[PDB]
Amino acid sequence: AMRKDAKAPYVTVFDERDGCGGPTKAGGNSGDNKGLCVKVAMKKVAYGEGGVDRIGEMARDVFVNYDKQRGK
Amino acid sequence: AMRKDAKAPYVTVFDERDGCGGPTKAGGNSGDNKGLCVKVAMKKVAYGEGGVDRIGEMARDVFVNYDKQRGK
Amino acid sequence: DAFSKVITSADGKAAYVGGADLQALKKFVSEGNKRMDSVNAIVSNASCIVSDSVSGMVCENPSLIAPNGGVYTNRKMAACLRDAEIILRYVSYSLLSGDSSVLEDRCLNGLKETYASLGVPAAGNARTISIMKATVIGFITNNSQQKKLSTPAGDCSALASEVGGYFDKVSSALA
Amino acid sequence: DAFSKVITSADGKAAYVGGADLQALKKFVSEGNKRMDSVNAIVSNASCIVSDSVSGMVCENPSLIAPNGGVYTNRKMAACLRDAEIILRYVSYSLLSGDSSVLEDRCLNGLKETYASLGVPAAGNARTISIMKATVIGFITNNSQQKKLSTPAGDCSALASEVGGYFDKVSSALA
Numbered sequence A, B: 001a002m003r004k005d006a007k008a009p010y011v012t013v014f015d016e017r018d019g020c021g022g023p024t025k026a027g028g029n030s031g032d033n034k035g036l037c038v039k040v041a042m043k044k045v046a047y048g049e050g051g052v053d054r055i056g057e058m059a060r061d062v063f064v065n066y067d068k069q070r071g072k
Numbered sequence C, D: 001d002a003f004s005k006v007i008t009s010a011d012g013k014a015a016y017v018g019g020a021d022l023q024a025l026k027k028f029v030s031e032g033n034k035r036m037d038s039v040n041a042i043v044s045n046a047s048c049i050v051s052d053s054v055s056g057m058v059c060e061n062p063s064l065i066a067p068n069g070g071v072y073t074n075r076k077m078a079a080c081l082r083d084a085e086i087i088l089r090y091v092s093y094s095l096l097s098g099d100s101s102v103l104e105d106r107c108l109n110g111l112k113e114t115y116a117s118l119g120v121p122a123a124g125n126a127r128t129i130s131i132m133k134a135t136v137i138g139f140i141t142n143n144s145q146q147k148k149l150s151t152p153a154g155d156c157s158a159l160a161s162e163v164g165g166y167f168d169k170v171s172s173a174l175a
């Protein structure tokens, strides 16, 4: 059921075939898919973290800029 | 001198006068200064952190979208 | 499978698949490479997609930010932006995995009833969802006008239709 | 003050100012409230400001991303975006503190020589800096067409001129 836990699957897709690698987190790094990795974590979607008020800044923006269209 | 360690002053200006407060880190969230705070740290400007490739994503965007003008 | 276990584990600690494990994983879903690019098109633009969608809900119905509107205060606006992101992330996982079972079970089952209990307006939710659907289809098909994505030349129409169906499951559950 | 000691401390760990201490901080600089709003305009929009500036450099000279180009690889483009952010952040601290001593000492002293040794081109830096200056001034002066700031109506012209002078110090040091 929807558990009211605000948890959601965070999927991150990495393509580092340019050669600038991030932290090693998976053991398979050789062959055709060298440089490619997918991560999934199941965690709370928080308003902010690490001192960074991510969603609060987005909220401030809506109130003042909802009349703007960032898609064009 | 410039130390070649990529450390810069991170200044964060908080205005939470809407009433939804973040974590308390100093006295004074009361009276005429309700909701206002300034933070400064001196730390490396990293390419990413916490698994989020912040500057790598910005670089990908430039390669494809340098002909776009996000200011209009 | 590695990822299914993340959904059900006690702490949701991240799992990672690269190289030969990822090659194997892509064999179990259709159009594996394009599918990864389609998922990336969602998650790498999560803030943009949520912002534009909630902003369009408000611009079409500014009473939502009038006093006693659904998102009048910053606290409520942020909760709404959060929920839109939660939904979007469950949709992204549906596209990664090729089905909607986790979305249905852990995001949708009980959600309409919770929103009724809270007084969260269904019309506003429907519009945030329909804009998120349109925005995601735009990014997947590289028809996003301010932010294109680099991918090998081709056609992602089938994956766009698939993701649209997952958004349609959200709409139908919340209507 | 306490923020000066953060700059010079061995570990740079954060300090915070609120309440009466924030009232005192604002007295010792001119136009304290508008100044805090101006610093906020810079740091809250740091990704946008840096992105538009470096993108402007590239669109005025697309050879920079072709093979044999100075930001051709992702690694180099990211180093350039990082450097633009470092400079912007030293400028933000100059506007917070009311002077440029830390910018000149810890960011600019030695930087022209370092870029010469690395082959970081002065003309590209000049354009990135000039766009960043114009962008920051635009944000501070209600000339940001895709992002309005919430501030009481009024005249921030002096603060825009001040921050312009800090950018001019960067330009002159790197020319």
Ligand SMILES: *CCC1=C(C)C(=O)N/C1=C\c1[nH]c(/C=C2\N=C(C[C@H]3NC(=O)C([C@H](*)C)=C3C)C(C)=C2CCC(=O)O)c(CCC(=O)O)c1C
Pocket: B066, B067, B068, B069, B070, B071, B072, D047, D048, D049, D052, D053, D055, D056, D057, D059, D060, D130, D131, D134, D135, D136, D137, D138, D139, D143, D144, D145, D146, D147, D148
């Ligand atoms: C995140 C960017 C942004 C938002 C959001 C917003 O509301 N304003 C924003 C940016 C902004 N940019 C400028 C000025 C300039 N930006 C550029 C680069 C773009 N022009 C291009 O030709 C190019 C590639 C094709 C770009 C990328 C340039 C060149 C300028 C002008 C600099 C100058 O010498 O004057 C501003 C300042 C206000 C303005 O509109 O000029 C702002 C706020």
Ligand SMILES: *CCC1=C(C)C(=O)N/C1=C\c1[nH]c(/C=C2\N=C(C[C@H]3NC(=O)C([C@H](*)C)=C3C)C(C)=C2CCC(=O)O)c(CCC(=O)O)c1C
Pocket: A066, A067, A068, A069, A070, A071, A072, C047, C048, C049, C051, C052, C053, C055, C056, C059, C060, C130, C131, C134, C135, C136, C137, C138, C139, C143, C144, C145, C146, C147, C148
């Ligand atoms: C971060 C946003 C973004 C970037 C960057 C980009 O390149 N594309 C982006 C978003 C995007 N939006 C849509 C479609 C819609 N967006 C809205 C909301 C805005 N329209 C308004 O009237 C309004 C208030 C002023 C907005 C805010 C709407 C309503 C839609 C269409 C919904 C529908 O039923 O059709 C897309 C899809 C592709 C396109 O450009 O049309 C994208 C990619």
Ligand SMILES: *[C@@H](C)[C@H]1/C(=C/C2=NC(=C\c3[nH]c(C[C@H]4NC(=O)C(C=C)=C4C)c(C)c3CCC(=O)O)/C(CCC(=O)O)=C2C)NC(=O)[C@@H]1C
Pocket: A047, A048, A049, A050, A051, A052, A053, A054, A055, A056, A057, A059, B014, B015, B016, B020, B021, B022, B023, B024, B025, B026, B027, B028, B029, B034, B035, B036, B037, B039, C074, C075, C076, C078, D014, D016, D017, D018, D019
């Ligand atoms: C309510 C849930 C809001 C929301 C607020 C958030 N604020 C966050 C970070 C933050 N806020 C302050 C200012 C506050 N603390 C003080 O001590 C004083 C005055 C003395 C004030 C005005 C600070 C200092 C911080 C950073 C904390 C730090 O340095 O670690 C924040 C991020 C929380 C976190 O990172 O853990 C949030 C979510 N955000 C929202 O979306 C709603 C509207």
Ligand SMILES: *[C@@H](C)[C@H]1/C(=C/C2=NC(=C\c3[nH]c(C[C@H]4NC(=O)C(C=C)=C4C)c(C)c3CCC(=O)O)/C(CCC(=O)O)=C2C)NC(=O)[C@@H]1C
Pocket: A014, A015, A016, A019, A020, A021, A022, A023, A024, A025, A026, A027, A028, A029, A034, A035, A036, A037, A039, B046, B047, B048, B049, B050, B051, B052, B053, B054, B055, B056, B057, B059, C014, C016, C017, C018, C019, D074, D075, D076, D078
């Ligand atoms: C080089 C400096 C680049 C850049 C790279 C970054 N990648 C970041 C995070 C990241 N990258 C991967 C994929 C990589 N790890 C693997 O094990 C495999 C395959 C087996 C690959 C292809 C992952 C998994 C991660 C997340 C790490 C995590 O979950 O903690 C990253 C953020 C670093 C961090 O969060 O500490 C960066 C900066 N970024 C750039 O700007 C240049 C171009």
Ligand SMILES: *[C@@H](C)[C@H]1/C(=C/C2=NC(=C\c3[nH]c(C[C@H]4NC(=O)C(C=C)=C4C)c(C)c3CCC(=O)O)/C(CCC(=O)O)=C2C)NC(=O)[C@@H]1C
Pocket: A013, A014, A015, A033, A036, A037, A038, C022, C031, C032, C033, C034, C035, C036, C037, C038, C040, C041, C140, C141, C142, C151, C152, C153, C154, C155, C156
């Ligand atoms: C719709 C989404 C796009 C479109 C996508 C295409 N991608 C194609 C090939 C391709 N993409 C990747 C990267 C992808 N695979 C992964 O495992 C991960 C990270 C974990 C990512 C980000 C790869 C490796 C490939 C194979 C070829 C290559 O190396 O470049 C592709 C070609 C057809 C196909 O391979 O099925 C397409 C069409 N292309 C578009 O034009 C729309 C907008």
Ligand SMILES: *[C@@H](C)[C@H]1/C(=C/C2=NC(=C\c3[nH]c(C[C@H]4NC(=O)C(C=C)=C4C)c(C)c3CCC(=O)O)/C(CCC(=O)O)=C2C)NC(=O)[C@@H]1C
Pocket: B013, B014, B015, B036, B037, B038, D022, D031, D032, D033, D034, D035, D036, D037, D038, D040, D139, D140, D141, D142, D149, D151, D152, D153, D154, D155, D156, D159
């Ligand atoms: C140019 C930068 C803008 C402009 C800004 C104005 N701000 C004015 C007054 C004001 N701003 C704040 C918030 C500020 N002070 C803090 O301590 C902090 C956080 C630590 C911040 C974010 C306050 C508290 C005030 C006093 C008024 C109030 O109580 O809201 C202002 C009025 C003139 C003045 O007080 O000096 C202006 C013009 N306005 C513009 O049109 C440009 C775009």
Ligand SMILES: *[C@H](C)[C@H]1/C(=C/C2=NC(=C\c3[nH]c(C[C@H]4NC(=O)C(C=C)=C4C)c(C)c3CCC(=O)O)/C(CCC(=O)O)=C2C)NC(=O)[C@@H]1C
Pocket: A002, A003, A004, A005, A006, A007, A008, C054, C064, C069, C070, C071, C076, C077, C079, C080, C081, C083, C084, C086, C087, C106, C107, C111, C114, C118, C120, C121, C122, C123, C124, C125, C128
């Ligand atoms: C945005 C398009 C909406 C809007 C959304 C609001 N949701 C509010 C609170 C809320 N949302 C949920 C569901 C969320 N939690 C989960 O665990 C999951 C899935 C795993 C989801 C999608 C819950 C359980 C809650 C209540 C508990 C909480 O706040 O975390 C909310 C605040 C309501 C209030 O406090 O009155 C809002 C504003 N509101 C709108 O008007 C648009 C249509």
Ligand SMILES: *[C@H](C)[C@H]1/C(=C/C2=NC(=C\c3[nH]c(C[C@H]4NC(=O)C(C=C)=C4C)c(C)c3CCC(=O)O)/C(CCC(=O)O)=C2C)NC(=O)[C@@H]1C
Pocket: B002, B003, B004, B005, B006, B007, B008, D054, D070, D071, D076, D077, D079, D080, D081, D083, D084, D086, D087, D106, D107, D111, D114, D118, D120, D121, D122, D123, D124, D125, D128
């Ligand atoms: C962007 C507008 C430029 C551009 C910038 C590049 N800088 C590169 C390496 C680099 N930058 C610095 C200065 C930086 N480190 C600091 O500690 C401070 C201030 C405290 C700053 C401003 C250093 C010391 C270095 C080398 C060490 C490092 O990488 O951290 C760089 C990579 C060059 C290379 O590796 O060959 C670039 C691309 N490049 C351009 O084309 C535009 C004009």
